[PDB]
Amino acid sequence: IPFHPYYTIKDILGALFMMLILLILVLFSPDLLGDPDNYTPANPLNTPPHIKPE
Amino acid sequence: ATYAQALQSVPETQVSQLDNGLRVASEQSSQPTCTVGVWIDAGSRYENEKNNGAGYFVEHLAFKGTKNRPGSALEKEVESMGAHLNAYSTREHTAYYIKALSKDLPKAVELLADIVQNCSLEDSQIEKERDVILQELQENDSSMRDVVFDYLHATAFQGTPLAQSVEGPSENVRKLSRADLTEYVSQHYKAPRMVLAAAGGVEHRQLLDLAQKHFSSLSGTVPAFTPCRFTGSEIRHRDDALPLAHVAIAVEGPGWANPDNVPLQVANAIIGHYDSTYGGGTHMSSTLASVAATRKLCQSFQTFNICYAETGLLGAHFVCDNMSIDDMMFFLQGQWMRLCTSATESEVVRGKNILRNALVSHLDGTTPVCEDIGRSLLTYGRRIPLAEWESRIAEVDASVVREVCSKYFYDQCPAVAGLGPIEQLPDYNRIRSGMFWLRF
């Protein structure tokens, strides 16, 4: 089937759903996945309790 | 001799009406040859799912034998005096007409009176005609244009008797008992739904005398069709082995009434027609024709205005290779919207001249004149004089064409029918989106 008539609006819906989730995260639980320890000046004199990546 | 004088010099077609309801019409001008024909209001539009194809079978058996004239003797009487007998049965009309000499008019009616009223319907003739119809259905299967048009009718009038083909399904043709044929003749060959047209050198008084003497015994003094519906769809028969790709796209147009036919027939005349074997080609006024000739984008294209009583199909049918269907769709749709949005006066004048030539060229010769008389009496209820046609053409201008095209073309769901290597045919969503212009 041609891409324009169908697989544009479907991708539009997908991108809208992705935006729904993404603004839910941004606007209700901003620092959800991020570790709170980032909100602290980087002091090389103190190792954090647990060093973990994303 | 300034056209208008010639238009008013055309002899008029007097119309009379017998008690039975047969509408007798004649138009004598000079000729020693005449075309006399009975037009019935029967056809595939009236037959139900089981009677589909009965009209075709009746037309086939009409000439084979009658009651008064047993079998081939009928043909003898037609051949001995040089007359040419013919019959055609479209979806909503049937017609049996003979071309004969002016002298043979008294006989000419009689044979016709034998054919329409008292046929033979011999069982063995039915048995052989069944095989004849099956083979003819195969021939029509080989007819790619006719197959495409039948597909268009099926997909446009879906769920209505109009979608039924004239010949009927092959399964029906097998059963088709003689009782069904007799019933169909009884309830579809009645006197009120008959027009006895006669062109050429026939006197209306003589025609009335012969019709009264030969048609009085017919039924003197009920399913009468129903408004069909348009179902914008498409049927795609992907058959890649076929050489060319026949495509036909149509929209709901007007009927036999609804004078919008006159402007629309102008607009279609603007699009015109063209195939491989033509003249100027790239120099043709039609933008679609010029582009197709310049880029060799087609092997044929045509604009059709099939109009039934309650509705009709108005559109274009083109024949092109498998690698030019999409470009054809673009250009045809673009021409449609160009007419809808900005028609211009010069294009409308060209269309008016073309349509003026169409009617006068068509209404030449005894047979086309008689056919026009019958069709006009059945459909319009009257034979429209050429002067009235000229006036209706004159009243058409650019604004009227733009308005009617916007009414019938702009933003409408079309009915499409493709056959052959039609895989490049744009998806129905693309086709429908082509029927509205964002710029406008």
Query: Residue B215, by phi and psi: left (phi above 0), alpha (psi -120 to 50) or beta?
Result: alpha
For residue B59, indicate whether it is catalytic: yes
Cα B440 from Cα B438, distance rounded (Å):
5
Q: Enumerate chain B positions whose Cβ falls within 8 A of a Cβ in A.
A: 426-427, 429-430, 433
Do the beta carbons of residue B371 and residue B95 sit within 8 Å? yes
First to last CA, chain B: 45
Strand bridging mode B415-420 / B234-238: parallel
Interface test with A, best of B330, B428, B430 (most A CBs within 10 A): B430
DSSP H or E run through B210: helix B204-215
CA distance linking residue A20 with residue A16, whole number of Å: 6
Closest CA to B249 of B413, B416, B411: B416
Please report residues of A whose CB lies closer than 8 A to that of B433. Answer: 5
Of B230, B242, B381, B426, nearest to B321 by C-alpha is B242
Burial B303-312 (b: 16+ CB within 10 A, else e): bbbbbbbbbb
Tokens of A2: 């041609």
The one-letter amino acid at B143: S
CB B326 within 8 A of CB B426: yes
A36 CB contacts (<8 Å, ≥6 apart)? none
B25 near B194, Cβ under 8 Å?
A: no
Strands (E) located in B264-401: 274-275, 300-307, 312-320
Which one, of B159, B140, B160, lies nearest residue B150 by Cα? Answer: B140
- B331, B334, B336, B342 alpha-carbon torsion, rounded to 10°: -140
Quick check: B135 and B104 in contact, CB under 8 A?
A: no
Separation CA B214–CA B336 (nearest Å) = 51
Catalytic, out of B47, B59, B129, B252: B59
* CA distance linking residue B318 with residue B336, whole number of Å: 14
Residues 6+ apart with CB under 8 A from A40: none
Give residue A11's identity as a one-letter amino acid code. Answer: D
Residues A2, B426: C-beta atoms closer than 8 Å:
yes
Task: Count interface pairs A-B at CB distance under 8 A.
Answer: 11
Contact B337, B402 (CB under 8 A): no
Residue B324: which region, alpha, beta or left (left: phi > 0; alpha: psi -120 to 50)?
alpha
Resolution (A): 3.6
Instruction: Determine the distance from the C-alpha atom of residue B186 to the mean position of all C-alpha atoms in its chain, rounded to a whole number.
Output: 24
Helices B345-362 and B386-395 cross at an angle (nearest 10°) of: 170
d(Cα B104, Cα B87) in Å, to the nearest integer? 19
Q: At B198, phi and psi to the nearest 5?
A: -150, 115
Q: Which amino acid is at B4?
A: A
Say whether B99 sits in a helix, a strand or coil: strand
What kind of experiment solved this structure? Answer: cryo-EM
The span from the CA of B119 to the CA of B130, in Å, is 17
CA nearest A1 in B: which residue?
B427
d(CA B148, CA B255): 22
Distances B132 to A33, B88, B126, B222, B415 between C-alpha atoms, Å: 80, 17, 10, 32, 32
H or E segment at B7? helix B4-8
Strand ranges across the sheet with B274-275: B234-238, B415-420, B245-252, B312-320, B300-307, B274-275
SS3 at position B95:
strand
Q: What are the chain B neighbours of A1 within 8 Å (beta carbons)?
A: 427
Q: Is A16 left (phi over 0), alpha (psi -120 to 50) or beta?
A: alpha
Nearest CA in chain A to B432: A5
The half-sphere exposure of B158 on its side-chain side, counting CA atoms within 13 A, is 12
Residue recorded with tokens 């006036």:
B391
Token pair 């603004």: residue: A23
Question: CA-CA distance, B122 to B67, in Å (whole number)?
Answer: 10
B340: its two tokens: 């809808």
In sequence order, which residues have a C-beta less than 8 Å from that of residue A17 and are 6 or more positions away?
A: none
Give yes or no for a contact between B11 and B204, defined as CB atoms under 8 angstroms apart. Answer: no
Pull the structure tokens for residue B345: 């006066």
The burial of B159, by beta-carbon neighbours within 10 Å (0-12 exposed, 13-18 middle, 19 or more buried), is given as exposed
Residues B211/B24, Cβ–Cβ less than 8 Å: yes
